[PDB]
Design a protein around this ligand. Structure first.
Ligand code: CDL
Ligand code: BCL
Ligand code: BCL
Ligand code: BPB
Ligand code: BPB
Ligand code: U10
Ligand code: U10
Ligand code: SPN
Ligand code: LDA
Ligand code: LDA
Ligand code: LDA
Ligand code: LDA
Ligand code: LDA
Ligand code: LDA
Ligand code: CL
Ligand code: FE
Ligand code: K
Ligand code: K
Lengths: 302, 239, 281
């Protein structure tokens, strides 16, 4: 049958591409990594280079500090026994301070002081990484869309681990670092607030979450369907519309009575996705601060 | 109640956003037209956005959208009905005329440039250091059409240099001239390359390019359009 | 009406059924045979839902609900007022979705593009048929399917899930969840990447895909590429739905206890089941 352009038939390699320079301090750019032929069947085969300035090493360092701080506590929960460490890997958990300690930093290390330590490293790593997404786009003269979208995910994470614990008066409200334990946190958060299915911002979050899989299915399928006219060369189809962009628009117009442009679809995309965590963070933030039971609230407000 | 205020606010913001997004997606193909090319009476409830202007790199100019809109080419079709909404029959050969699934757009008759100002796409022979690195190398394989006859032989690959991917196969025909086939429209097999969109006899009609070492956006659209149109238009006579 | 560039593409041909008979548009909408099918099925189903609404006794979107036949009915018909309406509406809905996808195929053939879109849509259709058809039939009753109502089908998600405890512990559901969240992440990045290149700093020139590759390599040391990101978005999305359908096809059939207990096969492995320490020793 016909070729579907899901997997490359013939990979070609040339000299390692070191990238645009613009205003980038090339001293902080690494050298290219190896070439993964495996990756090459789906996307690009070239790994690297990576930029790693000071903000970069800072972020990377505190990230592992966050991670090792958890894994240290996981080993101690395993009594340093490698066999139980793997056996119970999904059951270990680094829990926040008990409600007693409020918003203070007085809790002992094996009772949430360590949670606060790892949280601090996480705070540093994420926010520095955010700065990286702005700065790397600035160095290249590009818009700040990536950092602006990233802020929307940061919103929810900030609400879950920082803003909402503070507004509720204790660190005990925050999410624990652990595989099964934070799943339990999630389930119990819903039960305690009268079923998040009744949180209207939670419902919106789902609509955008589902919607993102819908839109990216539609979009990804459309571009593949017109990649026989260069459809994936989207920036040049924006600058000088081709038969690829016209067939794409007309598929949807004929199907559902309206359509996008090659640029506009990407505005639908960025908003569909960022609204997931935007509504999400609002709905968590309101929970227990303003609304204690979403069923109850739903009886009075709709 | 604060949550009620937040959710009411959000629904208002979401309506403004959808309105914004819809207008943003009217910077091509609008105003709507009747089948005869004139402005349609009913344009829908969304207005055209204020124009924006893209600064193209490499002195290539600008693009301002929405702007005056012309096909900038004749269109060999005619009405098949006395009222709106029916198909329009090709007045000639639809693959020769570039209509239907064989359609092409009058894109700029220059090639696409990379970030350094060089041509995005080159035949591999003229691309320093570029080689086949995985999968079957098609160069040298016979090319078979959907009528199961050999139409030519692969003589090079045309590669996207900044993205390092194959984009066309350059195929040589019986008369010694070449054509470009879109990479996405061939099947590289072990003993051949198979093209299901075209029969062997339609290969000579693939639009040719003017320079043997570059291809223009306009030429790509004629090649891609032509080959894709074979799916509907070759199928009758051959298969 | 037509877009500026539309008329050259409105040629005859592409249909799978009926030849030229339904080969025409209505405004922007293409019709075809499967446009008529879709209209018939959709209109029937909607009428039945409005009828099932009078039998229930409300014209309120937040209260209209259409429940399947109770478990007592097994896999057989039921009186319309008590789940026959749901059954026939399900047939309409399957009819309209499958018609819509086949109508998309015909649009694909007229336009000379690949079939990736209705193929992708068919994954959503099969998730639906998993909940309303495949899983019910494997379980012996239409009553295990979800009702058609805005809030009542949410209650069904909650009641079905809590039947197995916290449903998070369904391991296929864990994979599906990961694909959904990865997909959204890819969607935000992709949208923001193309726009940051098409809309650079004030007065600057429109950046290139080269800039897009450079940006991500600078950031994470890799760039999947402009063809790859579209392969990826499609693959994450369809995998999310596949593992969605899979996580429910196995629930109440091959596994029907608390999903949290499924994980004991790991911890009760012989080489470490009985070592003291940890959370389970
Ligand atoms: C409760 C409800 C609350 C809802 C929350 C809504 C949040 C809205 C965020 C708006 C961002 C606006 C960005 C902007 O300036 O626009 C330029 C932009 C121009 O095009 P461009 O390509 O984006 O420009 C690139 C530049 O040329 C090149 O420049 P650049 O790329 O360097 O600049 C990036 C630019 C462009 O960036 C974007 O396109 C943004 C896309 C991602 C959205 C990011 C939002 C994430 C924020 C999370 C914060 C969580 C807080 C929780 C609350 O972003 C900005 O200019 C600054 C934005 C500042 C807003 C952030 C505030 C944080 C405090 O146009 C828009 O983005 C329009 C946005 C649509 C808004 C719809 C408004 C509806 C109003 C309702 C009234 C309806 C009444 C009738 C009913
Ligand atoms: C998918 C896994 C679960 C399930 C779990 C949930 C959960 C959990 C939630 C929803 C939510 C919603 N679900 Mg549900 N839902 C299921 C199956 C369905 C089916 C179906 C035929 O299979 C449909 C039509 C819907 C439809 C809906 C909407 C009412 C709402 C937002 C969806 C959305 O944005 O999606 C992404 C799609 C788009 C953005 C495209 C537009 C889709 C539009 C909005 C659908 C309109 C449906 C219309 C009201 C149905 C009647 C149609 C007429 C009779 C013709 N669900 C199954 C059982 N669904 C949320 C809500 O708030 O509910 C009150 C919510 O929190
Ligand atoms: C029993 C469980 C409860 C319930 C309890 C909750 C709770 C509690 C929450 C959700 C949340 C969400 N739920 Mg719910 N949920 C239920 C039922 C459902 C159903 C369903 C089928 O019924 C669905 C589809 C969903 C779906 C969703 C999402 C729409 C939403 C999360 C958005 C998101 O992407 O967050 C994920 C995105 C983030 C967390 C942001 C991450 C950003 C940071 C900056 C990233 C840091 C990375 C770090 C440094 C590590 C790096 C590693 C790298 C490898 C280097 N829920 C039931 C009723 N749900 C959230 C929400 O918003 O609710 C309103 C939430 O907090
Ligand atoms: C709706 C909005 C969506 C969205 C949006 C956006 N999200 C973005 C951006 C945007 C727009 C970016 O611009 C940015 C980025 O750059 O993207 C490539 C980012 C990011 N979103 C991440 C994770 C994430 N987003 C989630 C959610 C959504 N986001 C939602 C759905 C979720 C969950 C839980 O759902 C998760 C886990 C990171 C990949 C990254 C932050 C890195 C960081 O802050 O690092 C700081 C940390 C480090 C530098 C190092 C940490 C050490 C690790 C643990 C490694 C140890 C390795 C070990 C030795 C080897 C094995 C590996 C093994 C553990 C596996
Ligand atoms: C597989 C990966 C994703 C995926 C993919 C794709 N999705 C596509 C396509 C692709 C690729 C298309 O090509 C196609 C389309 O054109 O897009 C614009 C489509 C579409 N996806 C829709 C809904 C959608 N996708 C969801 C999920 C994903 N999508 C997943 C995540 C979800 C949820 C819940 O998550 C929803 C609600 C419609 C907008 C549209 C079909 C219209 C239709 O078929 O019209 C024909 C039918 C009608 C006009 C109405 C029929 C009415 C019946 C007979 C009476 C009602 C019966 C019903 C059971 C009642 C339910 C009540 C409710 C409260 C429970
Ligand atoms: C690069 O390319 C791309 C484009 O193009 C340039 C695009 O446009 C699109 C398309 C994407 C968009 C336009 C973005 C917005 C889309 C979403 C957020 C997805 C949600 C979609 C909807 C909510 C619309 C749903 C509407 C439907 C399903 C049709 C409505 C149906 C009717 C009112 C009539 C139905 C017609 C029938 C019954 C068939 C026959 C017709 C008769 C009248 C008979 C994509 C993906 C793309 O990647
Ligand atoms: C203009 O274009 C553009 C390009 O080009 C110029 C680009 O390059 C890119 C750049 C894009 C990238 C480099 C990739 C960006 C996306 C990501 C970083 C996310 C992608 C990650 C993957 C696809 C691989 C990982 C996917 C996962 C984890 C889903 C699979 C899940 C599992 C199978 C396991 C998960 C479940 C667990 C762990 C529970 C255990 C399960 C048991 C049963 C036990 C973009 C955005 C772009 O826009
Ligand atoms: C082999 O073992 C070694 C030792 C090598 C290892 O290192 C193994 C490592 C591990 C096994 C680590 C495993 C890691 C996990 C299991 C991670 C699980 C984490 C989650 C599931 C995260 C859930 C959500 C996390 C959230 C929401 C965090 C929010 C953080 C806050 C926003 C931070 C706010 C900061 C605080 C509260 C501190 C005070 C703030 C200041 C500004 C000072
Ligand atoms: C999200 C995917 C991340 C892929 C990370 C690739 C790492 C960059 C490789 C740098 C190579 C440095 N070195 C030593 C080979 O020169
Ligand atoms: C940018 C795309 C807009 C997508 C539209 C989403 C439809 C929302 C329907 C979900 C209803 C949620 N709620 C509040 C009633 O629970
Ligand atoms: C989220 C709710 C879903 C509503 C579906 C909206 C579809 C609109 C199609 C409009 C096109 C028809 N027309 C003539 C106005 O162009
Ligand atoms: C969207 C804003 C969310 C917070 C608004 C103000 C509420 C802060 C918390 C105060 C009430 C919390 N508590 C414990 C008394 O319920
Ligand atoms: C949740 C998706 C919302 C879709 C919004 C509906 C848009 C329909 C209006 C499109 C206008 C078509 N028109 C008339 C300008 O050609
Ligand atoms: C539910 C529909 C799924 C979409 C199928 C995508 C591939 C279809 C190929 C159709 C070709 C039909 N035929 C036999 C005339 O060639
Ligand atoms: Cl925008
Ligand atoms: Fe795209
Ligand atoms: K409560
Ligand atoms: K070479």
């Amino acid at each position: 049958a016909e070729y579907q352009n899901i997997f490359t038939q013939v990979q070609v390699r040339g000299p390692a591409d070191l990238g645009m320079t613009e205003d980038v301090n090339l001293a902080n750019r690494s050298g290219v990594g190896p070439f993964s032929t495996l990756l090459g069947w789906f996307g690009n085969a070239q790994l690297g280079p990576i930029y790693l300035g000071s903000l970069g090493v800072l972020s990377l360092f505190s990230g592992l500090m966050w991670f090792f701080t958890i894994g240290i506590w996981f080993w101690y929960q395993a009594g340093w026994n490698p066999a139980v460490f793997l056996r119970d890997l999904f059951f270990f958990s680094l829990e926040p301070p008990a409600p007693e300690y409020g918003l203070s930093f007085a809790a002992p290390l094996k009772e949430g002081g360590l949670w606060l330590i790892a949280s601090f490293f996480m705070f540093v790593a994420v926010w520095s990484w955010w700065g990286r997404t702005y700065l790397r786009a600035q160095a290249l003269g590009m818009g700040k869309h990536t950092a602006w979208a990233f802020l929307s995910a940061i919103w929810l994470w900030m609400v879950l681990g920082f803003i909402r614990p503070i507004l509720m008066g204790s660190w005990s409200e925050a999410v624990p670092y652990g595989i099964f334990s934070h799943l339990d946190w999630t389930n119990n958060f819903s039960l305690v607030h009268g079923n998040l299915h009744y949180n209207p911002f939670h419902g919106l979050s789902i609509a955008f979450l589902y919607g993102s899989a819908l839109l990216f299915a539609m979009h990804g399928a459309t571009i593949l369907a017109v990649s026989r006219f260069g459809g994936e060369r989207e920036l040049e189809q924006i600058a000088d519309r081709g038969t690829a962009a016209e067939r794409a628009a007309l598929f949807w117009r004929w199907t559902m009575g309206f359509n996008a442009t090659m640029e506009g679809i990407h505005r639908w995309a960025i908003w569909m996705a960022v609204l997931v965590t935007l509504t999400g963070g609002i709905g968590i933030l309101l929970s227990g601060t303003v609304v204690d039971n979403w069923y109850v609230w739903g009886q009075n407000h709709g | 109640d604060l949550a009620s205020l937040a959710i009411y606010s959000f629904w208002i913001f979401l309506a403004g956003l959808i309105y914004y997004l819809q207008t943003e997606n009217m910077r091509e193909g609008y105003p709507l037209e009747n089948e005869d090319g004139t402005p349609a009476a009913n344009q829908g409830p969304f207005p055209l956005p204020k124009p924006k202007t893209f600064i193209l790199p490499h002195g290539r100019g600008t693009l301002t959208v929405p702007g005056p809109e012309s096909e900038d080419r004749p269109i060999a079709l005619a009405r098949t009905a006395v009222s709106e909404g029916f198909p329009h029959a090709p007045t000639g050969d639809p693959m020769k005329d570039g209509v239907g699934p064989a359609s092409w757009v009058a894109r700029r008759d220059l090639p696409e440039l990379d970030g350094h100002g060089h041509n995005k796409i080159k035949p591999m022979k003229a691309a320093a250091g570029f080689h086949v690195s995985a999968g079957k190398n098609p160069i040298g394989l016979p090319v078979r059409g959907c009528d199961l006859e050999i139409a030519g032989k692969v003589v090079d690959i045309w590669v996207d240099i900044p993205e390092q991917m194959a984009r066309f196969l350059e195929v040589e025909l019986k008369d010694g001239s070449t054509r470009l086939l879109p990479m996405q429209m061939v099947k590289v097999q072990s003993n051949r390359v198979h093209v299901n969109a075209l029969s062997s006899d339609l290969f000579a009609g693939i639009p040719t390019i003017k320079s043997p070492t570059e291809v223009t956006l306009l030429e790509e659209d004629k090649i891609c359009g032509y080959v894709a149109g074979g799916l509907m238009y070759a199928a009758p006579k051959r298969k | 009406a037509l877009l500026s560039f539309e008329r050259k593409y409105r040629v005859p041909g592409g249909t799978l059924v009926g030849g030229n008979l339904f080969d025409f548009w209505v405004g922007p909408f293409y019709v075809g045979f499967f446009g008529v099918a879709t209209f018939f099925f959709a209109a029937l189903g909607i009428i039945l839902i409005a009828w099932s609404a009078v039998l229930q006794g409300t014209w309120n979107p937040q209260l209209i609900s259409v429940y399947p036949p109770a478990l007592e009915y097994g896999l057989g018909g039921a009186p319309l007022a008590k789940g026959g309406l749901w059954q026939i509406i399900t047939i309409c809905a399957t009819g309209a979705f499958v018609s819509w996808a086949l109508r998309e195929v015909e649009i694909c053939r007229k336009l000379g593009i690949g079939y990736h879109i209705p193929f992708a849509f068919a994954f959503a259709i099969l998730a639906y048929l998993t909940l309303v058809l495949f899983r019910p039939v494997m379980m012996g009753a239409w009553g295990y399917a979800f009702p058609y109502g805005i809030w009542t089908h949410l209650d069904w998600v909650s009641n079905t899930g809590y039947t197995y405890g916290n449903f998070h512990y369904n391991p296929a559901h864990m994979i599906a969840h990961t694909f959904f969240f990865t997909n959204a992440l890819a969607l935000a990045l992709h949208g923001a990447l193309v726009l940051s290149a098409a809309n650079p700093e004030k007065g600057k020139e429109m950046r290139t895909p080269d800039h897009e590759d450079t940006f991500f390599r600078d950031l994470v040391g890799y760039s999947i590429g402009t063809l790859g990101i579209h392969r990826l978005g499609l693959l994450l999305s369809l995998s999310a739905v596949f593992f969605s359908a899979l996580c429910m096809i196995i629930t109440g059939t091959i596994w029907f206890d608390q999903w949290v207990d499924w994980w004991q096969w790991w911890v009760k492995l012989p080489w470490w089941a009985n070592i003291p320490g940890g959370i389970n020793g």
